Amino acid sequence: VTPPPEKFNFAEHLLQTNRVRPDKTAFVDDISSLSFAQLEAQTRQLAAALRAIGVKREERVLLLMLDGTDWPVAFLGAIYAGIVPVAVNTLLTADDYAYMLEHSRAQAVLVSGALHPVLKAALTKSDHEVQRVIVSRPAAPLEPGEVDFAEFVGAHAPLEKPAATQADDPAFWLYSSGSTGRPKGVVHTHANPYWTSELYGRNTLHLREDDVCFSAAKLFFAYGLGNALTFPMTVGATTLLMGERPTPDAVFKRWLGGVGGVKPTVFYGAPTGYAGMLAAPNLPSRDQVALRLASSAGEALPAEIGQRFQRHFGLDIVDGIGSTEMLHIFLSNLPDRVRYGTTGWPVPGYQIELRGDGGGPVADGEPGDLYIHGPSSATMYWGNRAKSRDTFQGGWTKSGDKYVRNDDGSYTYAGRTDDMLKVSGIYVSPFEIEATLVQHPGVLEAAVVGVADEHGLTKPKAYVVPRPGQTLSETELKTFIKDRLAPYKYPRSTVFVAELPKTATGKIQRFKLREGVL
Numbered sequence: 001v002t003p004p005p006e007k008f009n010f011a012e013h014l015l016q017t018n019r020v021r022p023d024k025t026a027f028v029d030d031i032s033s034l035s036f037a038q039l040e041a042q043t044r045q046l047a048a049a050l051r052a053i054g055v056k057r058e059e060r061v062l063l064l065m066l067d068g069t070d071w072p073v074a075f076l077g078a079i080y081a082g083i084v085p086v087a088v089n090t091l092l093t094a095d096d097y098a099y100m101l102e103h104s105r106a107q108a109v110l111v112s113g114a115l116h117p118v119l120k121a122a123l124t125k126s127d128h129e130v131q132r133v134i135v136s137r138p139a140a141p142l143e144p145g146e147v148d149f150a151e152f153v154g155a156h157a158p159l160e161k162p163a164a165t166q167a168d169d170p171a172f173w174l175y176s177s178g179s180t181g182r183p184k185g186v187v188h189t190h191a192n193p194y195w196t197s198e199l200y201g202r203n204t205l206h207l208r209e210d211d212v213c214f215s216a217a218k219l220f221f222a223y224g225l226g227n228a229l230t231f232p233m234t235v236g237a238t239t240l241l242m243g244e245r246p247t248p249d250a251v252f253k254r255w256l257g258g259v260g261g262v263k264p265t266v267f268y269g270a271p272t273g274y275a276g277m278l279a280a281p282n283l284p285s286r287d288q289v290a291l292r293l294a295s296s297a298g299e300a301l302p303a304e305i306g307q308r309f310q311r312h313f314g315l316d317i318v319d320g321i322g323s324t325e326m327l328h329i330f331l332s333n334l335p336d337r338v339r340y341g342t343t344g345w346p347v348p349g350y351q352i353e354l355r356g357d358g359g360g361p362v363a364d365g366e367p368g369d370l371y372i373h374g375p376s377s378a379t380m381y382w383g384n385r386a387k388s389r390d391t392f393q394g395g396w397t398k399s400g401d402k403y404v405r406n407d408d409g410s411y412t413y414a415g416r417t418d419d420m421l422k423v424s425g426i427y428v429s430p431f432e433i434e435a436t437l438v439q440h441p442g443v444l445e446a447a448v449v450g451v452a453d454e455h456g457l458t459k460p461k462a463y464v465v466p467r468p469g470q471t472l473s474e475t476e477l478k479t480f481i482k483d484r485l486a487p488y489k490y491p492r493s494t495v496f497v498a499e500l501p502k503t504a505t506g507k508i509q510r511f512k513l514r515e516g517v518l
């Protein structure tokens, strides 16, 4: 793969790629579609609009939007202007967004109507610098000074040229949380999504122009941003976008061509989703779908789910691993070489090392900490030099995973270095779940660990010491956590215990809870 030039604006790159196919559909959702020409026009009109309201090159804007055709307009339009969109998870709290507004010093916000109430609370509470709120598909009346996204875009002529950025200039941020502390601003450059899209999208997956891409993973996830924006636009594929929560039924409707007159050929999702669909009584038959490639990430794929999928559809599930910091997948099975029980082989262009307790070598078959050297690495966590030092170790990026290398050169997952769980395809901190449980007045103590379910997928499990003299039922606790945690964070079970295993300092011995001592 040829490196991108030094003068490179990633948005311009994707637009120029598709000037050969102006009338092909670029994006379609439940209510709208954009051809590549339409996407270009709206992108460049947005870029002008953000400049007209005073947002300058290198300044941030918050992009808080459901998957839909306005999403790539927002993302690429900022980047075309040389403005840095901060693309964020749509299921967070107003407090999370308040922190992000302050930390990013976002100058404007692009927000879905459905997300305007949480955003409004974030604005009200924070010491932000937001000059304008631009609302895509408003669900309530606009407040004074707010603007409808379609009017904002429509009222401005297209920007005539892109910002003259460098390949290594920041292009956009994603946020990533660790087991404690605030979300970290992962800073990606213009070059980074070129590299993922070429090394993985084109050269590993072999995506092509006649593909229709559909990702259960939303656009704000690094995984989904590649799958459903950077990858398809690199090759000229059409992409289907869905605003709603993925369920088996929602995914099947789309697989069957229920939206936009298109049937996906490439699907992407998490192993939990694949398990859910395979359990669904109305799982479509092979002859009803146009799938040629199924990608998986977000948690280790249990071999049985891949094997069952292949028995049913005649398609393997291609499981790979990436990180937010590396932008996309660097270690993967291949469409024509799958070894279930493994994450496959290093992606050409990326070097992988396993390091032991001193940074030393680990013998094949022994677990080490995974480090990656490749050209799509983020540069830093913005404003966090200490965590930057820990993760970005001189050309090598630490992922937080442990792995074993097998005799065939494949790699098998061996857990985390940082207490995080990967549940339903998403990172969740046990300490967050514990923090929520102990605020119930009936709970004295709580410890949360990962447990494999009947399909071998990790789900949280809570061990709770009740407070003497209160009452506390499992169902009381279910109701308490309902609206305090996202549903993927719900413990799959709660065990009430009289005490937890601890050191003499009171540190919970979590390892004993995984080993079944209770």
Ligand SMILES: Cc1ccccc1C(=O)O
Residues within 6 Å of the ligand: 222, 223, 297, 298, 299, 320, 321, 322, 323, 324, 327, 328, 329
């Ligand atoms: C965390 C992540 C980011 C980009 C692509 C894949 C992954 C993963 O979940 O393995």
